[PDB]
Design a binder for this molecule. Structure first.
Ligand SMILES: [Mn+2]
Ligand SMILES: [Mn+2]
Ligand SMILES: [Mn+2]
Ligand SMILES: [Mn+2]
Ligand SMILES: [Mn+2]
Ligand SMILES: [Mn+2]
Lengths: 175, 175, 175, 175, 175, 175
């Protein structure tokens, strides 16, 4: 029972996808779905006193250029628990490379929080909030000798194209 | 692996049942067991700044008039995590309709918290605490245009009859 | 010393005011400044499982129609501690009556959280969030038999005029 | 100003007293009012992984056999912040000796939490909860080599007589 | 899907084992893996206001003298969620009997928290921290009439011998 | 009264100093004592999702090259509340420049937490923890366009000399 393989990418792809959350906002512990058992695993404790600024996880049945499930960041007011599924509306995409392939990350809002009803595109997000997320990813591995370049942000349409591409990559890899 | 179908309704039905908790007390996020995978899912974020006043979930292998597993509310001092099983003693039952069928909810205490040892019936609960729970359910969907009528509270015996009825409903539906 | 009397209403009244916080967002306990002494006092525990949706306090050296210091609600991502001073930009005002008294409340954002840099008027707030604040005040005293009437929301300009009026009422009262 | 000296012992002594809280329920840090100044001070960190089971503080303008202000324990569902004033109804008293000193402690409920409306005497408290409070004081200083003797619990009447006695000791000491 | 049987004892036994956490540090609720379904279950609420001083759980595919999976205590700065796997370096072992067979417990640190990089043996732990853990286990069931004798602490080498013995016990019992 | 002016620098200067805490570990809100009044004020919300890695405050009756009270960082397992006094043993000093000003900060442990009994100098601190504190100050104002230079860490002896120097600067400034 590995929810990464068992759940479909979403109920109305790519307008609404499922986000399987691994890390709640506010966590300094970096969790991930164990590849084998699908249990939650501690990947590492961040080397710096930083916390995930968003609920962070993966879209089920996706694969990406970086050889991982496609990352998704969901803006939740109250963080969820790890392994919670959220119906999420993609509104943009963070463009970054940590190495050699794209490690881009979808930015999304919960469909079922009315607070975010008018958040439909990247332009709807407060600039300082985008800058805080980009900064987190730019620096959170700095003490691990890792450097990352944030290229910028793409819009909702680009996010949705990339989601479809990641769904196709998963089908091509696993069938 | 869906714990709703896999776990028995309880170790000594209906004097002690299992409560599979979906929502810890204090949550504004309304979680539920995903029908298909049995993973935790965000159903919605409550539209108002209210929090679940009890640990809330379902009794495994039950079905009810409203076409859902039978709801159970467990009074915990320290909330549990979602998907935690609690051995629970039914002490009463909240009578309400949100629509057209009974959406009644068992009120229970943890067998293994000695704080609640003398809580055996509805009359053992502070009146204001019952009124706070009823009020939560009366108003928590008010901004979703939903109206609910709380009829009142039934006693431990009535709660136990309803649990047995819900166990029979599940057997009749699924076998 | 009593901070309600010792602090000025703000550093750039009424464009920027001091909010002296009594109740952090997420509190079910209703604290209030004892103007006998400067000390935080538990006014009551809310009768329902509701939490303050905003950091809630008073503007120093103000008074109001309801015989209290003028209320201010500050939108904070991370709640502050009681008795914390926040430099706040008024962006609107909630118009409500409590138990027959005009009991309006300023809505404001923290000047020094860049997240809110572009919140400058009431139209900048998500409608669902305004609705949730109003609903809270509509229902939080319902089990206490008290009645509130929410009239609606005024804009930043009206909030600022009310601030000036409340500043004069303090002079009228104590001066 | 020093709130231990500036506040009265209560608004309706000894039926209702002020509890000036030093330690919120759930704290492992042992705070205490610095009666040099009014300020909260870290007295120590408990040597064991135990937490205060009650909101713990002092009654203003009291003194006691052990050379401290008279201790009061308030049963709060949601803990208050340190230095919060609570209007408290004494319902009993814990009789204990600390390091050879009479060090009894009032047990009280908040007047303004309707949850506790019918708690008026020591027989209203769950026995397991009384046991847990006593056990905490029995063992919390064990790694510090200190010995405590818990004698038992007295009723509301005895608590109130002790409150009056402690009020007179303050006059004897400072008056 | 029972993670106790499904996961291997560790990636580099016995230098690095997997710790499947049942109870996060700070919990008063005592959780355990349900024997049958492998869901988290509330075993009991501790009878005293004590909290687990470490993240507590089991090593997968182990069995011990006491007829349970072998216990492991992991020192985490930020507690994990129940059912999280942690790669853990054994540094010592708490020797205790609660009854008649050894109920010894491995003490470990997370490999992937650099804070603990130089914690490799029992001598690396602050004495007061060992004393706090031993005290917790000595007293936490005191109100349940249970008495426990803490014998002392063994070193990293002894911990590793015992882990290997527990791995062999599991193979002998289940195959 | 203003605790920065009313409290002495410590009970056994400079071996033991008072730390007046402004910011609890784990805070993203940057609080500071308003030396206009004694009151806690929100200075800003950090622009990045970082949290203070230490309990952060000032030493009473000190002043410094940067025109502020001398900064002190206290390593607390459980964070204290703002405005809490902690008796602290200096063990080292972080040497850094903020915006062109010498802005060094004492590192200290609480005298009354036995966990830290053997932390008496800078070599007693895990290197990763020193690195995480420095990194925090290296990057926490990066989105604010401010530059900091971390020089390194000095030992307990140097910290204590700096404390004496800062005590004299307060006399120079106010005396
Ligand atoms: Mn990726
Ligand atoms: Mn139902
Ligand atoms: Mn008002
Ligand atoms: Mn005493
Ligand atoms: Mn064992
Ligand atoms: Mn400085």
């Amino acid at each position: 029972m590995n929810p990464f393989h068992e759940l479909e990418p979403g109920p109305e792809v790519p307008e609404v996808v499922y986000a399987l959350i691994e890390i709640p906002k506010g966590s300094r512990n970096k969790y991930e779905l164990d590849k084998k058992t699908g249990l939650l695993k501690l990947d590492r404790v961040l080397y710096s006193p930083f916390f995930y600024p968003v609920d962070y996880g993966i879209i089920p049945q996706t694969w990406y250029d970086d050889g991982d499930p496609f990352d998704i960041m969901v803006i939740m007011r109250e963080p969820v628990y790890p392994l919670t599924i959220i119906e999420a509306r993609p509104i943009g995409i963070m463009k970054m490379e940590d190495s050699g392939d794209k490690d881009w990350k979808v930015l999304a809002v919960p469909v079922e929080d009315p607070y975010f009803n008018d958040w439909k595109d990247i332009s709807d997000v407060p600039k300082a909030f985008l800058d805080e997320i980009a900064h987190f990813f730019q620096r959170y591995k700095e003490l691990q000798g890792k450097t990352t370049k944030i290229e910028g942000w793409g819009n909702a349409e680009e996010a949705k194209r990339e989601i479809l591409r990641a769904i196709e990559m998963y089908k091509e890899k696993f069938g």
